[PDB]
């Protein structure tokens, strides 16, 4: 499995980053957001066979769309909220809800990263860069 | 023959699942519906040379369209009600009748999966996922 | 030569079947029509190098378009009435007449199978199915 | 050579046949026309490297266009009247004359085989059939 | 170098032929025209690396367009009047008239062969035929 | 990493050149512009795996887009202002402003080289030329 | 590097030729124009890795577009006036000026060869001919 950083092409310096909770980057449920690119383990990801982006912070930590559209790392499972696919420079969630929309990895406000409905996603360009 | 789970792309966690009958998942005539994905034997399927989806629950259990459009596993024979083919993420039965329509594998409410006329099949996206 | 059943995709369970004459499935001139699929010898066919569909019921029994468009098995010869080719799931006869049309293998009601002018052949999907 | 019968696809049973003349089928200048297919040597042909159809009745007997569109077998030479090429199921002569047309092997009426101007050749389908 | 005859497809029996001068086919400046095909050396040609058609009559005898558009065999040189190329069954000279006219090998009457402006080359089909 | 000069195809003799500061071509912050091509160290560049153009003048000197679109060499980092990619003879910056504008390496008068919005870039052809 | 003559396809016998100055074909600044083709060293050329056409008359002599659009041989350098590329039978200079046009190697009357704006280049067909 190929390990990558996920760098925004919509901001001159922002990578997808596991913040964690209270200093601990390895915890299940740890927050994921944007940070300046440095390429440490908490900015490294790998796309597995089940379309999940696994973080290098620890075993069994997958990138997860939450109900309020924020991102965390969680135990890896079958839910579409953990499945991701690329179309060009767009990184798209398989998450479904009642809105009839695809949700895209997106910077919404300043440097805050979440998923955003396709028709609203103004800063949604990304590049997977081999580590 | 590749063994797959049949996971919905229209529901965040539903796989095609042999419920069985009377607690026994191996029984001829057992019911098929949807369930949280766990990838056990009663959620593993293989498409054979005759376009039948064989369940891994036991020998000679093929996914079958019933007269009322519910699904079961039955002994494998020649009927078109046991034949399936893919078009993109749609899984289509070869079953024919007088209603000028193709029937698609479709979630019809809750954890219930049946086949539904094409023009009405709104929860009908699937991904055959190798195991 | 691949041995196949010829199964309908226009009927939930129908295979091209040599009925024969008076119980004998092997006779020249025997009727061919539809039946539930079972894969026994009178439902097995082979497409030969002359584009004929040879039946397994006996030597020298080829699927034949008759003048009235019904199907029988007959001694194998050169006639276009015995020549068949595929386009997708359509099985087409090389038979010619004065009506400017191709004739397709077609279910014409119940278990009756005949050939039908292309533009009117509405139950005419088939799958040559490798014998199991 | 690939030895073939030349069977019509415009008639339920007609092959290109050396009739001959005097009952002798080997004679130069012998007539060629249509007959029910039987694959004896007077219906077997081989296309040589100079695009001539050589009959198996005897040595040096090529299929030849005459100016009145009738067909014979004649000694083999360089004339375009003896050169043939395929376009799909059409068998076309290289013969030229003042009528600015390509001539196609064709059943003119009944069982009468000649060559015919392309725009008039309505029974001109053939299958070169391996012996 | 493939030795060929150059047979017309516009005439039922005509090959490009070195007439010579007074019975001698090998003479420099010898006339070139058409004849019935027999494939002797004065009808055999080979296309060389400089796009010249060399006659098999004798060494250093190239098919040459003259200013008056007649054909001869001459010593081999660099002039475009000795260069030839095929487009389909057309055999085209690289000769420049200053007109932007392409001159095609063409039968101009009886057994006379010359090159002719493309727009009016009415008998200019050829087949290079392996010997 | 292949080492190249970046020679303009929009000016008869201009190469991308580190001017440096006070004759010192090695300084961080040194200006980059155009000069006649000579291929000394301050005209040699290498594209690295992070898509940065590293100058040969000294270690850790990457070609950098500034906020006013002028070019310098700076310490190498992760910022898009230092990332470049080719499309034919165009060398495109990943630098982001608000406008969705792509900025191209472009001559903007005399020997002045900067990045210019794609629609305006009239002298933006370049050839990466092996040393 | 393949040694070629550059022969016109727009004139029946013209090759690109180093005239030199005063009988010396070797001198820097020597004139280049058209001549009957003979393939001596002053008509032999080689396209190098920098897209320069080097002449065989002497070392370090490249075909050079001058400001007045005449051609000479000069010491080999980086200028686009010495760079050449092929598009079909067109030999195109990389020379740029005020006019937004490509300049093509072109016969401009008699044996005068120059570069001409593409739109007006009507004797500009060439064949690089292996020696």
From Swiss-Prot, chain C:
Bacterial hemolysins are exotoxins that attack blood cell membranes and cause cell rupture by mechanisms not clearly defined. The lineage of its organism: Bacteria, Pseudomonadati, Pseudomonadota, Gammaproteobacteria, Vibrionales. Belongs to the HlyA hemolysin family. Residues 2-129 form the Ricin B-type lectin domain. It comes from the Bacteria. The chain holds residues 338 to 468 of 471 of the full protein. This is Cytolysin. The gene is vvhA.
């Amino acid at each position: 499995m190929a390990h990558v950083t996920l760098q925004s092409l919509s901001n001159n310096d922002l990578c997808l980053d596991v913040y964690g909770e209270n200093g601990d980057k390895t915890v299940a449920g740890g927050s994921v957001n944007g940070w300046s690119c440095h390429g440490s383990w908490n900015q490294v990801w790998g796309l597995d066979k089940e379309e999940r982006y696994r973080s290098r912070v620890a075993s069994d930590r997958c990138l997860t769309v939450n109900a309020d559209k924020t991102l965390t790392v969680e135990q890896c499972g079958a839910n579409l909220a953990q499945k991701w696919y690329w179309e060009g420079d767009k990184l798209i969630s398989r998450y479904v809800d009642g809105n009839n929309t695809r949700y895209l990895l997106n910077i919404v406000g300043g440097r805050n990263v979440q998923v955003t409905p396709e028709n609203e996603a103004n800063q949604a360009r990304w590049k997977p860069t081999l580590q």
